[PDB]
Amino acid sequence: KLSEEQQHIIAILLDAHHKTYDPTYADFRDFRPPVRMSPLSMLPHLADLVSYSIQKVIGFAKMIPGFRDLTSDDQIVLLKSSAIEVIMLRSNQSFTMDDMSWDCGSQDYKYDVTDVSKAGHTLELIEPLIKFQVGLKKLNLHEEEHVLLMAICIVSPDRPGVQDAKLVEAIQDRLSNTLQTYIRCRHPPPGSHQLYAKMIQKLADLRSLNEEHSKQYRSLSFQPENSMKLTPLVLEVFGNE
Amino acid sequence: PMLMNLLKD
Ligand SMILES: CCC(CC)(c1ccc(OC[C@@H](O)CO)c(C)c1)c1ccc(OC[C@H](O)C(C)(C)C)c(C)c1
Numbered sequence: 001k002l003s004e005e006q007q008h009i010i011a012i013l014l015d016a017h018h019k020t021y022d023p024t025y026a027d028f029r030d031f032r033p034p035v036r037m038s039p040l041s042m043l044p045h046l047a048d049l050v051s052y053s054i055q056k057v058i059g060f061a062k063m064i065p066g067f068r069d070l071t072s073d074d075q076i077v078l079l080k081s082s083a084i085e086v087i088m089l090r091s092n093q094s095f096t097m098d099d100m101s102w103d104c105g106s107q108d109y110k111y112d113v114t115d116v117s118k119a120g121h122t123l124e125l126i127e128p129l130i131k132f133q134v135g136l137k138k139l140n141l142h143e144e145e146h147v148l149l150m151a152i153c154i155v156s157p158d159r160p161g162v163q164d165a166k167l168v169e170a171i172q173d174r175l176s177n178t179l180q181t182y183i184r185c186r187h188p189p190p191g192s193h194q195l196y197a198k199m200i201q202k203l204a205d206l207r208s209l210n211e212e213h214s215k216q217y218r219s220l221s222f223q224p225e226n227s228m229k230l231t232p233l234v235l236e237v238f239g240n241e
Numbered sequence: 242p243m244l245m246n247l248l249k250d
Binding site: 058 | 242243244247248249
């Protein structure tokens with residue numbers, strides 16, 4: 001079946017997500033305001049959004065079974081390289097397929113393609129990003145598959161600079177095996193057909209989005225007027241040496 | 242920095 005250990009992994013991951021994902025979006029009132037009326041008018045608001053999301057990704061990662069047993073160095077490597085990908089994953093939960101937007105509970109916090117461009121990004125990122133969100137939504141993942149996918153994304157042994165790639169892979173494979181068993185046990189046809197392979201392809205697509213995001217970010221953040229609008233945490237996690 | 246300090250333990 002799903003073993004007791006596998007069912008325990010899922011319960012831990014679900015609780016971690018529930019503890020780090022507020023589906024009421026209460027905290028958003030404290031972000032710098034959306035400005036839509038370029039100069040990059042959404043940059044302050046989306047910087048605070050992302051900075052908040054990084055704090056939640058860290059809290060989630062901390063609870064992935066095994067993650068605590070990696071060295072500090074490997075933990076930092078994994079979080080820095082995956083943060084943007086997990087934020088893209090976790091955003092899918094507010095994503096609405098119909099109008100290609102992220103609905104975070106408020107007319108002001110319904111984000112669209114123009115909003116993202118007003119943080120300095122171009123359609124070279126934004127269009128593939130929308131296509132990702134759409135394709136991911138159409139997988140109709142259960143919450144268990146969603147949180148397993150985020151955990152797998154974080155614990156990737158191929159990330160630049162990982163030292164104990166053996167231990168990372170062992171932790172990842174434990175999570176992948178949990179996922180595959182969950183799909184075999186619980187996910188109904190036809191949605192279950194090649195589902196694991198589709199999910200793995202989404203992780204590949206995320207590396208592409210990560211690369212394009214990082215290029216665009218490196219460029220925009222090189223302008224001091226933009227950099228000044230970013231939070232110290234964003235600057236550290238998307239930047240540092 | 243902040244990541245390292247949050248992960249410390
Ligand atoms: C607006 C949509 C999106 C999608 C991932 C985002 C992020 C986090 C988030 O939150 C989801 C959950 O974490 C809520 O708890 C929600 C709904 C949406 C985003 C946001 C910002 C973005 O660019 C930011 C810049 O690179 C910056 C210079 C400021 C660092 C990009 C490309 C996408």
